[PDB]
A paper describes a structure:
The TREX complex is found in all eukaryotes and contains the multi-subunit [name] complex, the DEXD-box RNA helicase [name]/[name] (yeast Sub2), and an RNA export adapter such as ALYREF (yeast Yra1). In the current model of mRNA export, the [name] complex is recruited to the mRNP and delivers [name], which subsequently ‘clamps’ the mRNA.
Each monomer is partitioned into two regions, one formed by [name], −2, –3, and [name] and the second by [name], −6, and −7. The [name] bow and adjacent MIF4G domain bind the [name] β-propeller, and the [name] MIF4G domain makes additional, extensive contacts to the [name] helicase.
Numbering used by the authors:
A (entry chain G): 21 to 39, 44 to 102
B (entry chain A): 10 to 22, 29 to 38, 44 to 65, 71 to 84, 91 to 120, 133 to 167, 227 to 278, 296 to 334, ...
C (entry chain B): 165 to 183, 188 to 255, 263 to 288, 295 to 307, 343 to 354, 358 to 366, 369 to 386
D (entry chain E): 41 to 47, 55 to 74, 81 to 137
């Protein structure tokens, strides 16, 4: 959401920089590159969180199978 | 100018020495991006709460940093950091809370979502009658979809099924760890009928549907007379509660009046 | 309300049971987390239950204290001002309960409840505040309400409240 | 599909090296190529984030359905134990 707007703003700032002042523009471009690297690291962390959420969903499915076995044992106890 | 950035990263890596060696908007931008890089390294490598306390001591952008931290940490450390946020107390707060609502599946995390919404409020074999199952839960889907309660044929099925279910409820006459949602079980089917509180749920849902219909979008006046007749029969069946039938009936009357108040003011 | 019907139905049917406070708090938190319930509207439902149930006082007082421990104190003041602008002695009863034991708030409710009209009536001589003086005496808060000096004693029912006291 | 199979961070490292080379040259077409590569990398990152979020939402919905079925079975077992 906001990361797409930040990436579009970084692309617009890079296009404006390509269009003391040069050193300040180079510092701003390095700042935009650092923000883009932070966004790429956030995307990699989001992918790792998606893989961990899939692993937790598989663990929840195994716990649901164990709870179905416990429900059969509770049916025998009932 | 990146030499000042490296000097800032040397000074921040305790907090009093960073505040002494920190000594006008672009320098603060380099400082905030240094905090971005250090927090990203700490997410790669608890300490995040310490850096958030440091930013709250020194200082916009900490909302973005906490949003990134809550996006990274899935389940447990997200809960501890949200308790830290509860200990701490613009649009970024609402964005973080909407992301927490959308990421959770509400299977066992409904308590955490309730704490989020409280924070937002602080901000602002046996023969089974399967036909009874099908008719009752088709009526339940009619309760779920009041938009479907505007047609003719769906209204006719609502009439027939509602009159049959209310006939069963009048013919029963019982005369006498928490389960979150409704139990769609074809197996037992009798513990819900023996519990009068389940019928209290169903008749409250009838009364809310009737008050919404009284509250295009037009109906036949004969249908409204049918609704009033069935509404009076619902008041009759709720007066038949052996613990405080008439008292709880007057309670529901007062609640209906107050719902009319909240509708007509808003 | 018009989207989540089962949630408010469960709230009313759970508050409709016969009389454990923290279990009901867990049930309220579960219903709020499941059905996207507005916490202010849940607070309205709890207040109107306590209006319609004057029997079990301190139980619902403890529930309101544990609920308002997680919220802002001015919300009950705005809700009671909204209910007083909505209109019934149950309103005066619940306001007398909520201004005696805990969460006492006299200034904001006096803002929500006429002063220049009362001064003009007192000069020419020479509604809900009176009901609050009736239900509150049913004590220092009433003395703060007292500061015309004899307008309350000019009514009979306030004198009957003071004489019963 | 193909970008999900190929994924990633090496393109970001190459863009950072091209940015360092452009900052060394500034002290032409490489700046335009690096900007186009940065825009393509941002679009690919947004697409991969949307695909991962959709897959996580599908897994969360399936796990919520399985947990609801297991909770219904456990609630029926608890009601059968409370009946006896």
């Amino acid at each position: 959401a906001g990361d797409d707007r930040r990436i579009n703003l970084l692309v617009k700032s890079f296009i404006k920089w390509c269009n003391e002042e040069g050193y300040s523009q180079y510092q701003r471009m390095l700042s935009t590159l650092s923000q883009c690297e932070f966004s790429m690291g956030k995307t990699l962390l989001v992918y790792d969180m998606n893989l961990r959420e899939m692993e937790n969903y598989e663990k929840i499915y195994k716990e649901i199978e164990c709870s179905i076995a416990g429900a059969h044992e509770k049916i025998a106890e009932c | 100018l990146p030499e000042a950035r490296t000097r800032f990263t040397k000074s921040t890596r305790n907090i009093k020495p960073l505040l002494s060696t920190f000594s006008e908007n672009e320098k603060k931008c380099t400082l905030d991006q240094a905090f971005r890089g250090i927090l990203e390294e700490e997410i790669i490598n608890n300490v995040l709460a310490i850096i958030s306390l440091a930013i709250g001591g020194v200082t916009s952008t900490p909302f973005v940093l906490l949003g990134d931290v809550l996006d990274c940490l899935p389940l447990d450390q997200c809960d501890t950091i949200f308790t830290f946020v509860e200990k701490n107390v613009k649009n970024y707060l609402l964005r973080m809370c909407n992301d927490l609502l959308r990421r959770l599946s509400k299977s066992q995390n409904t308590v955490f979502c309730g704490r989020i919404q409280l924070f937002l409020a602080r901000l602002f074999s046996i023969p089974i009658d399967y036909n009874l199952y099908r008719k009752f839960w088709s009526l339940q889907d009619y309760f779920r979809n009041p938009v479907q309660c505007y047609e003719k044929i769906s209204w006719k099925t609502f009439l027939k099924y509602s009159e049959e279910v209310l006939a069963v409820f009048k013919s029963y006459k019982l005369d006498d760890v928490y389960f979150a949602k409704f139990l769609t079980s074809e197996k037992l089917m009798d513990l819900q009928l023996s519990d009068s509180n389940f019928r209290r749920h169903i008749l409250l849902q009838y009364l809310i549907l009737f008050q919404y219909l009284k509250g295009n979008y037009v109906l036949t006046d004969e249908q409204s007379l049918w609704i009033e007749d069935t509404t009076k029969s619902v008041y009759q069946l709720l007066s038949e509660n052996p613990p405080d039938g008439e008292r709880f009936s007057k309670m529901v009357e007062h609640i209906l009046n107050t719902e009319e108040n909240w509708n007509s003011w808003k | 309300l018009r989207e989540e019907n089962e949630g408010y139905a469960k709230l009313i049917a759970e508050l409709g049971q016969d009389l454990t406070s923290d279990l009901i708090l867990e049930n309220i938190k579960s219903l709020i987390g499941c059905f996207n319930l507005d916490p202010n509207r849940v607070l309205d439902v709890i207040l109107e239950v306590f209006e319609c149930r004057p029997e079990h006082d301190d139980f619902f007082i403890s529930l309101l204290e544990s609920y308002m421990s997680m919220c802002e104190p001015q919300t009950l003041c705005h809700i009671l001002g909204f209910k007083f602008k909505f209109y019934p002695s149950s309103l005066y009863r619940v306001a007398a309960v909520l201004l005696q034991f805990n969460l006492i708030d006299l200034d904001d409710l006096y803002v929500h409840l006429i002063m220049d009209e009362h001064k003009r009536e007192i000069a020419e001589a020479k509604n809900q505040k009176l009901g609050l003086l009736e239900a509150l005496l049913k004590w220092q808060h009433a003395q703060n309400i007292m500061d015309p000096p004899y307008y309350a004693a000019s009514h009979k029912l306030i004198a009957l409240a003071i004489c019963k006291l | 599909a193909e970008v999900d199979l190929r994924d990633y961070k090496y393109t970001c490292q190459e863009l950072q090296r091209l940015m360092a080379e452009i900052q060394d040259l500034k002290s032409a077409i490489e700046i335009e190529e690096r900007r186009i590569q940065s825009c393509v990398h941002f679009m690919t990152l947004k697409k991969l984030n949307r695909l991962a979020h959709i897959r996580l939402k599908k897994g969360r919905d399936q796990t919520h359905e399985a947990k609801q079925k297991v909770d219904a079975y456990h609630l029926q077992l608890q009601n059968l134990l409370y009946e006896v």
